[PDB]
Amino acid sequence: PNEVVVQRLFQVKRRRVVRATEVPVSWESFNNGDCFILDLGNNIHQWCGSNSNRYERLKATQVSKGIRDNERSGRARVHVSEEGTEPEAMLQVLGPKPALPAGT
Amino acid sequence: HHVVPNEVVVQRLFQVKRRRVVRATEVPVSWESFNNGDCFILDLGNNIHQWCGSNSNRYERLKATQVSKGIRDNERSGRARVHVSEEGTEPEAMLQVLGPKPALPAGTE
Ligand SMILES: [Ca+2]
Ligand SMILES: [Ca+2]
Ligand code: NA
Ligand code: NA
């Protein structure tokens, strides 16, 4: 009998969906590969890891400004910070910052 | 009912994360299946053609390499050659199967 080849095509694609999920208020929840939003009512702290991607950064900005504008009527301030510039108000709530995992 | 109404603030933390899974799925063998934001593997038996769009990410490229080598080493017992191409360098073997290349969308939309 003759040998056959089945001609095939694979598409290799990473899922695009970017989720914002509520997680425990703790440094435990942080990793340097994503973005995080700490909502404190009058103040909203947006924190992006050094290995976060541009879709996560965009989504984080939409979520933080969305809370400020569509939930606080614009009566809230968004503070953007990163590794090493975390403001005292984050540190009061989360406590002293430890080493964070790189991702996942 | 005189009251002193004290506002409650619930402190919350949100994680913003793009899903990590890279999928590899069979699609119709056609240029109509291609886009410039993903990677593709055209499996022609003895020859496996790996093609990465200009807007693909490193995880799609790594997964395409892993799947191509899996086809080569598992399903073909090593009796196959992987050829890497990209936009503008598609070999004649790809054009023979897919026909002349049209303009491709930049991504999925
Ligand atoms: Ca991430
Ligand atoms: Ca892609
Ligand atoms: Na074969
Ligand atoms: Na080539």
Author numbering:
A (entry chain A): 154 to 257
B (entry chain B): 150 to 258
Would you copy out the relevant sentences from the publication that reported this structure?
Each of these modules hosts at least one calcium-binding site and the presence of calcium induces both subtle local and large global conformational changes. Conversely, the presence of mutations in plasma gelsolin is known to be directly related to a rare form of amyloidosis, hereafter referred as AGel amyloidosis (AGel, OMIM reference number 105120).
Here, we report the crystal structure of the second domain of gelsolin carrying the recently identified Gly167Arg mutation. The dimerization interface between the two monomers mainly involves the swapped β1 strand, comprising residues 158–166, covering a total contact area of 2375 Å2. In addition, the two stretched hinge loops interact in a pseudo β-antiparallel fashion, contributing several polar interactions to the assembly. Contrary to this, the stretched conformation of the hinge loop adopted in the Gly167Arg dimer better accommodates the bulky residue, eliminating the torsional strain. Similarly, in the Gly167Arg dimer structure, we could only model up to residue 257 and 258 in chains A and B, respectively. In the other G2 structures, calcium is hexacoordinated by Gly186, Asp187, Glu209 and Asp259, but the last residue is disordered in the Gly167Arg mutant and, in its place, we observed a citrate molecule in both subunits.
